[PDB]
Amino acid sequence: RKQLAQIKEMVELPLRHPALFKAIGVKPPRGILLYGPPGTGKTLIARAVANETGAFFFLINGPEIMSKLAGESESNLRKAFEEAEKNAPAIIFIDELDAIAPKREKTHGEVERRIVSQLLTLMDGLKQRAHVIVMAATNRPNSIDPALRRFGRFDREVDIGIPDATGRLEILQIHTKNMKLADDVDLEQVANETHGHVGADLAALCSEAALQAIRKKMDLIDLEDETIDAEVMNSLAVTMDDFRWALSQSNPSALRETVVEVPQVTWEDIGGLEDVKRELQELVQYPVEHPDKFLKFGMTPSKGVLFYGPPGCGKTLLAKAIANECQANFISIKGPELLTMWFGESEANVREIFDKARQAAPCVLFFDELDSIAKARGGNIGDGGGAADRVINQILTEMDGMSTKKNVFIIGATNRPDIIDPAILRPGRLDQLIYIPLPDEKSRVAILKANLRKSPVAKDVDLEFLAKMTNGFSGADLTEICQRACKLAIRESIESEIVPEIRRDHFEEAMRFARRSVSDNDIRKYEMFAQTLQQSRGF
Amino acid sequence: NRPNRLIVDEAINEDNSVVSLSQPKMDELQLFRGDTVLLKGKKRREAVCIVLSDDTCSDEKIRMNRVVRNNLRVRLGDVISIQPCPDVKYGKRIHVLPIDDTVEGITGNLFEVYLKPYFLEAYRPIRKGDIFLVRGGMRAVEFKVVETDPSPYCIVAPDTVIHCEGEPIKREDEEESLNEVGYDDIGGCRKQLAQIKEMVELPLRHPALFKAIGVKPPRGILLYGPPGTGKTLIARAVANETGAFFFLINGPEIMSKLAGESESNLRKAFEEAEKNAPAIIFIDELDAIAPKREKTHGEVERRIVSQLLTLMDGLKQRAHVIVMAATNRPNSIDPALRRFGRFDREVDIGIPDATGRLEILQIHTKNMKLADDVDLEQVANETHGHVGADLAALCSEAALQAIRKKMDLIDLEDETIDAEVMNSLAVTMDDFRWALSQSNPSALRETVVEVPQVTWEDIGGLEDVKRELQELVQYPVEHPDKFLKFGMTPSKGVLFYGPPGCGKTLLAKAIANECQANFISIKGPELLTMWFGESEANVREIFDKARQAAPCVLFFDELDSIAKARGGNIGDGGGAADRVINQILTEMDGMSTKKNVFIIGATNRPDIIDPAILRPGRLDQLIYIPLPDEKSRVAILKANLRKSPVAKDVDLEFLAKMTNGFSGADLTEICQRACKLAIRESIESEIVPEIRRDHFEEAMRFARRSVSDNDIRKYEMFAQTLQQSRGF
Amino acid sequence: RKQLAQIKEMVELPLRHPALFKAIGVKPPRGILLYGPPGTGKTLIARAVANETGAFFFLINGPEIMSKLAGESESNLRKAFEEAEKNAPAIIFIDELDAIAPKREKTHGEVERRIVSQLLTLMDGLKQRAHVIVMAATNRPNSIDPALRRFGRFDREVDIGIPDATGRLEILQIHTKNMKLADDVDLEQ
Numbered sequence A: 001r002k003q004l005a006q007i008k009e010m011v012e013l014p015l016r017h018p019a020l021f022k023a024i025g026v027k028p029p030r031g032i033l034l035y036g037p038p039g040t041g042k043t044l045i046a047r048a049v050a051n052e053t054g055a056f057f058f059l060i061n062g063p064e065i066m067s068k069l070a071g072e073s074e075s076n077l078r079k080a081f082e083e084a085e086k087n088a089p090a091i092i093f094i095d096e097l098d099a100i101a102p103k104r105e106k107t108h109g110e111v112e113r114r115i116v117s118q119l120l121t122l123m124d125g126l127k128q129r130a131h132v133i134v135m136a137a138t139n140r141p142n143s144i145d146p147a148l149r150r151f152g153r154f155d156r157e158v159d160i161g162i163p164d165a166t167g168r169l170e171i172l173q174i175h176t177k178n179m180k181l182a183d184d185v186d187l188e189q190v191a192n193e194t195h196g197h198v199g200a201d202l203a204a205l206c207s208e209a210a211l212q213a214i215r216k217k218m219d220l221i222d223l224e225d226e227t228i229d230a231e232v233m234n235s236l237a238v239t240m241d242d243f244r245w246a247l248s249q250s251n252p253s254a255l256r257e258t259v260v261e262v263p264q265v266t267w268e269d270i271g272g273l274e275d276v277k278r279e280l281q282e283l284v285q286y287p288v289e290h291p292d293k294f295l296k297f298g299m300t301p302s303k304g305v306l307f308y309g310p311p312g313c314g315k316t317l318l319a320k321a322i323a324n325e326c327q328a329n330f331i332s333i334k335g336p337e338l339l340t341m342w343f344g345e346s347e348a349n350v351r352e353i354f355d356k357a358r359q360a361a362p363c364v365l366f367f368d369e370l371d372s373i374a375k376a377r378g379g380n381i382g383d384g385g386g387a388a389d390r391v392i393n394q395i396l397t398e399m400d401g402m403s404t405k406k407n408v409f410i411i412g413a414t415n416r417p418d419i420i421d422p423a424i425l426r427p428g429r430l431d432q433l434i435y436i437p438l439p440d441e442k443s444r445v446a447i448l449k450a451n452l453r454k455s456p457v458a459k460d461v462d463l464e465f466l467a468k469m470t471n472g473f474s475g476a477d478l479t480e481i482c483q484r485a486c487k488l489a490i491r492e493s494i495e496s497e498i499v500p501e502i503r504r505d506h507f508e509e510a511m512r513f514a515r516r517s518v519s520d521n522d523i524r525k526y527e528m529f530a531q532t533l534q535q536s537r538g539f
Numbered sequence B: 001n002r003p004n005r006l007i008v009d010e011a012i013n014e015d016n017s018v019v020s021l022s023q024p025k026m027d028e029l030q031l032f033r034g035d036t037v038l039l040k041g042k043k044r045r046e047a048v049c050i051v052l053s054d055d056t057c058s059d060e061k062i063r064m065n066r067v068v069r070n071n072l073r074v075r076l077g078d079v080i081s082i083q084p085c086p087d088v089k090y091g092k093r094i095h096v097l098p099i100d101d102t103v104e105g106i107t108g109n110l111f112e113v114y115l116k117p118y119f120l121e122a123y124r125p126i127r128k129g130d131i132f133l134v135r136g137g138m139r140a141v142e143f144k145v146v147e148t149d150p151s152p153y154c155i156v157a158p159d160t161v162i163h164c165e166g167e168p169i170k171r172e173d174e175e176e177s178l179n180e181v182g183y184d185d186i187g188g189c190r191k192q193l194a195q196i197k198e199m200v201e202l203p204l205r206h207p208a209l210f211k212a213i214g215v216k217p218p219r220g221i222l223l224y225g226p227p228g229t230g231k232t233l234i235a236r237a238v239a240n241e242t243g244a245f246f247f248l249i250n251g252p253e254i255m256s257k258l259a260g261e262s263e264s265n266l267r268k269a270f271e272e273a274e275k276n277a278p279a280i281i282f283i284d285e286l287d288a289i290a291p292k293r294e295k296t297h298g299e300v301e302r303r304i305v306s307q308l309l310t311l312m313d314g315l316k317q318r319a320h321v322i323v324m325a326a327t328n329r330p331n332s333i334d335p336a337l338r339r340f341g342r343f344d345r346e347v348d349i350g351i352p353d354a355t356g357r358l359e360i361l362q363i364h365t366k367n368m369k370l371a372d373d374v375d376l377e378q379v380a381n382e383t384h385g386h387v388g389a390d391l392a393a394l395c396s397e398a399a400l401q402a403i404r405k406k407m408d409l410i411d412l413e414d415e416t417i418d419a420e421v422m423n424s425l426a427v428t429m430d431d432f433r434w435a436l437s438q439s440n441p442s443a444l445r446e447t448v449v450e451v452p453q454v455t456w457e458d459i460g461g462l463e464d465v466k467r468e469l470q471e472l473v474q475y476p477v478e479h480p481d482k483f484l485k486f487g488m489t490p491s492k493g494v495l496f497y498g499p500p501g502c503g504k505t506l507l508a509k510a511i512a513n514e515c516q517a518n519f520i521s522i523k524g525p526e527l528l529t530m531w532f533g534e535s536e537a538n539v540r541e542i543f544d545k546a547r548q549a550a551p552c553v554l555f556f557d558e559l560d561s562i563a564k565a566r567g568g569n570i571g572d573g574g575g576a577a578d579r580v581i582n583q584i585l586t587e588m589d590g591m592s593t594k595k596n597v598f599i600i601g602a603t604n605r606p607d608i609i610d611p612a613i614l615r616p617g618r619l620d621q622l623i624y625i626p627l628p629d630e631k632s633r634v635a636i637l638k639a640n641l642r643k644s645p646v647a648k649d650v651d652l653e654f655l656a657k658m659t660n661g662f663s664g665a666d667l668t669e670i671c672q673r674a675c676k677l678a679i680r681e682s683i684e685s686e687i688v689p690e691i692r693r694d695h696f697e698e699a700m701r702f703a704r705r706s707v708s709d710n711d712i713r714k715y716e717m718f719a720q721t722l723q724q725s726r727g728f
Numbered sequence C: 001r002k003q004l005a006q007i008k009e010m011v012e013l014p015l016r017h018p019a020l021f022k023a024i025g026v027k028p029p030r031g032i033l034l035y036g037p038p039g040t041g042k043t044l045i046a047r048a049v050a051n052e053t054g055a056f057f058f059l060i061n062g063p064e065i066m067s068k069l070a071g072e073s074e075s076n077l078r079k080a081f082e083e084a085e086k087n088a089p090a091i092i093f094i095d096e097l098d099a100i101a102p103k104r105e106k107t108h109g110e111v112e113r114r115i116v117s118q119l120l121t122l123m124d125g126l127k128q129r130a131h132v133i134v135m136a137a138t139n140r141p142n143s144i145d146p147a148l149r150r151f152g153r154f155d156r157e158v159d160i161g162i163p164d165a166t167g168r169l170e171i172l173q174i175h176t177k178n179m180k181l182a183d184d185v186d187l188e189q
Ligand SMILES: Cc1cc2c(C(N)=O)cccc2n1-c1nc2c(c(NCc3ccccc3)n1)COCC2
Pocket: A264, A265, A269, A270, A271, A312, A313, A314, A315, A317, A318, A439, A443, A446, A447, A450, A451, A474, A475, A476, A477, A479, B616
């Protein structure tokens, strides 16, 4: 939705008013570069915006250029540009570009850099003259010739990520609108258990689910005829088990990367921690929702917040809770995934993970368990020197190039804040330090009312009573208690088959098998860094 | 709607023309057990068969064998009409003559050995124009009738005389030979075949049905499996047994010709399929067609890659055409071809297990009649890494050994061979024994997909962990209705820990077979030898095989091997983390909770593994394997000698009564020593063959302890206090 | 000695009885791959087993294929296979193969993988039809295209190592038989 409107801002404005641009000095768009993983819809949206404007549209994807003999491939591309000039206004769209201009460490073949030079010539000479726009699409950032990303050829780029749950909701109906659904069927719950599906994945899933429904009646009906009657087409309708069996197959097996979703946790949804709820807003909410402030008094807002404390305190959720109330998206970067993408002595994939948070403004970036990088360099005892890395210096240098007026907010999280370099803790990258203490009574009662929201828990139990005994337990312990109680209740529910509700004794058994996620000595270690922390800066 | 139409499906019985049905259809058409049934098809032809009764079957379908499928010209996915015919028929005179197209090299009388055993205990009627295939003499030959008694009135009875003439007739174009591959010529891959049966014949037998509906039919299907799995055989069968056109281009004939016409040949191979719709396209090898990877050598070879991408990208609906390709390894296909719309659906065909390998022997030795003392059961149990090609080569060379064993002394030098000695030949025990002792089993070994055969009664003891493993595996497999009414979510990972030699691999297998799931065993050192240095690139594909083979239970045997290489005993200055551990712990988090894939880890020193995989959401439940108790100690002894003639003088419970502080390795090695000493005195007495009490008595005294005592209390001090180690 | 008898088990059996294999279902051998260090005798034994059977034998080693101009090298190999079909039974022997199909980390040159694809085509299409066997020899295991070691092309391999003392005894006399030796001379020590 966000990616479409800003195309609506740069395509139809310089097309529906050709003579308006001829008098004004504003240079219209020429080149638009597309992004996104394969199957995102790089072709569908281009075809829609090229066919629903009335202007001419010409299609050349990539391979038909390299499929023909040498010599005429360049001529075809050259004529495809002059044919668009005469019938102005026109538009040009290129489906895949990564296999067209691989002017990188490959540099194989004489004829293939010829077409790269040909396209560079055909775009470099594009003065105003007529009203023509070329557009290209690709799958990864490190696949476009850097000579094409210069100003005047490809200076404006849009990143289209994997849709979230509410983004994936509309994709189901925009393809199943001709499929009338029964009363007991809804598309809401089925689009909630998935988190990495794109339009192509959902289209394939619905197609095969419909095939399953077709065969479920063709196996017993056995109607062998050429033409089919409409008296049975209308009676057919997909059921619950079809969408259940569709996802249990191998079609969800796809590629997973940084997903852009919006959180759904707000102030009433959580409880307690009034001492840090009062403070996080002071440094996030106001310099987002109050543009008039923060420049009359001078000064400048922060960019970075480092979260620290006992493990299992729910730092990721605490960071999400503030990002959704400022009308910003959220990208979750957990520790080990930034380590598995490191390989050895070659990553070359850092600069592009920050731009997605920039095009999707406003956005709140989160680094979950940043302590993973220090794990690999040196842990526990450590090496002879500092725990610095070529992946840490490159990100701490990258976060300093941004202007203070951008709304991008980076948030770090760690669990052992004594081994991280003060280099990122410098006054100007990570200024404010915020401590996450153990959950109090108001949060302990809330976590229990939240982790069983979809269970038929009887009213015989008391929610406040559990938090009354539970004092020295962390979020992991509070969750695993409920997990154990539900696990024992679900066993007796099946055993009675040889009524299905959770009773007080079910929580009572889970009470006795409780353990402590954290010890005691590490606690006072954590709140001795809280009051005296500015002393560690610089030394 | 005339409820008599039945859907055609292949039969499972390995015999002559016998059609199986269900029980409601038995009483619906008022037909008895043994009766003459009438079958009607298209092209105005009549065929007869026998209805067989079955109860353990599917809901509603017929079982249509290939012998009369060619007789009635009916393929898979068509319709068949059945009706009773209570007509009394008696056979007196039948005339049959072979065709001179396949009788080369056969001399002598062929009616007293190929027609006598085939007719007795059959009572199978015949019609005019029936094409039935018989077996015998290392080959299969079909018969055809030209003139006989007026059809029908033909029943096999001993009172029917025969007489040969000695003049074959020329075969016409009305029928086809049965020597080609059919749907019944493939065995070993059963799950992989049915889901192809779900995506090939459905969008082909109903072309106009898809034109009205909005469901997009399949276009590209990518095959997998090690070489020799059968990537060509199944494709040829599914392309030839559907009636649609099939065109073959493997890979090398494209690159063998001169530059310029190779692309033209591929371009014309696609337009020739459009006009004669419906058609199908199959590509034998693809890894050598599109190597758009670190190779990128040669100008003309990426030209054909772009040509094929162009020819598949432009494939709109139009006609009903499907392209299929096969390969040998996952890291050999151009990633540009695996996009949505070209290759989005993939099937993994692994090495068949023992019961999978059983059928491959007979589907190639059916023409080889075997003696009484020979069976194919035991010979397919000692092997674990053979595919169809390996077994075919093994049987071919075993037959050659049998041929030479009589050609060395018979010395019959003649052009044509007689059938009087072909029938007398039969392979023996020593042939299959000597076949495997040669170098033909030397092949490539990888992850094999087998089903365990150990259940609750097969093992004993450990009631405290049998009671618990089921609570977290069995119910959220066999009870789909649960685990969402109460909310919550099932687990994915279980980590096994304790003294070495406790049988953790077997304990993990015991639960996987009772939930109707396959099993893949990943032992420690094999995932280390595939690591090399700074380059593995082979992790992402080892998890998808457990996903396509749902349900499946994955097992990591001795995960502690990875920590061994990074740092052991003392350890390094930091954590024992690795780029092979982070990439798998990140991969196991991308999966949805509703998948039925279950990963199980096993270790022996659970104090040096990173808590990163022990996070609450990857490895939540921790299960301890204690020392075997009395009930398991008696069971292991009754299990490890199941194939030995142990006398009744010994007592099974008595041994477990002395044995208290011994582990599974010790319990096994005691029996190994007892058998080893008994087998020596058995041979020494030759200068009776049963195990006596003293044989176990000597093994009793030479017993050792696999584990010490101090490590024990170390193991059960982590059992009660383990949640404290999470996070620190 | 051991390596020879098992060739005696797979060459003359499917050649001296052509019509016997036509009636039975046993698939005769097609491809036989040789091994051994250079000078082991990969050519001598092939010539002996091809000349002492009466069947036709055609020789193409390796380099004459790559020595000629581009375009006719493939035609020569193609015609060398059809010339053997008409005069059945026949046999085909290739002297060196490591320099014919280097489909490995080398992958240099356009025309040289062309002949690899040509030979793969000419062997892949070999159904029963006549009684023809192709044989090839090499010097090291990591020099054959893995695509050629598949089932049906090269699935049976023999390793011929360096002969031992008693193995080396006979080699002296099989070449010095025309050299009459004195009384005080012996080839044992
Ligand atoms: C499933 C869940 C697990 C978990 C864990 C854990 N160690 O697994 C830790 C913290 C919160 C957790 N939650 C959780 N999840 C949510 C909420 C919520 N309550 C408020 C809260 C969160 C963090 C802090 C204080 C209080 N708690 C609120 O609703 C949305 C999701």
